[PDB]
């Protein structure tokens, strides 16, 4: 008479911590595949809006499956702790690949910055076409499979477009339009964060947290990357961080662009 998670899964290793929980690679005993399962470090719960778990729960019931969104399977409770079961991306974070890149002197090259952004753009389009918005796009929440395809994860900041409940994501990928509580075009904030996400993958410095370097970036000023790229590509990238607001390309207008 043990827990659903004990009886159903075999816990292989702990693989990360986030959204107020711990994630473990787990083999499901009955089908023998691998899943990433996040166990809430806290109990149900707090007040809404700024509540991760309700954002995750709402997003997982609105969205279906898409090849570039990390697939959701099941979610349940244990001793008042929430447990989320998602597909297991075996290549880890995109952030982790950039680090092992950076320490080893290498850097993602323009043919790969392009494919990183195209595939994420496809996944971002499915979210927005479901009238949802991610609100925490960064290499931490992009996952690699067969390691090749990138998928978006962490929906602790996700929300409906129509009646939004907004908790701003990571500040280093945060569009100033969101910081000033202008939710007139929320999907464009993921576009903005994606533009910076691709900047991190090209090899840019660790992004600024606040101050003038922050304020400099949100004036359309792309962060410095020790790398030269096509100014046809480089123009598209700065149209993604451009200041305010509806001008930035839609995830569909990005999933069509022959530059990519
Ligand atoms: C929600 C449950 C968040 N989430 C996912 O849905 C998935 C899916 N797939 C992964 N894959 C993954 C595999 C392996 C690693 N590591 C390998 C071992 N090294 C030493 C560290 C990295 C990482 C990721 N992960 C998923 N997560 C997930 C995993 C870890 C942290 C997070 C947070 C911080 C909540 O986003 N999410």
UniProtKB/Swiss-Prot annotation:
Tissue: Expressed in oocytes (at protein level). May also be expressed in testis.
Entry binding sites for ATP: 15-23, 38
Nuclear export signal (motif): residue ranges: 112-126
Post-translational modification: Phosphorylated on serine residues. Phosphorylation leads to increase its activity.
Subcellular compartments: Nucleus
Record disease entry: Oocyte/zygote/embryo maturation arrest 5: An autosomal recessive infertility disorder characterized by oocyte inability to exit metaphase II, resulting in fertilization failure.
Protein name per the record: Wee1-like protein kinase 2
Gene source species: Homo sapiens (Human)
Residues included from the entire protein: 204 to 486 of 567
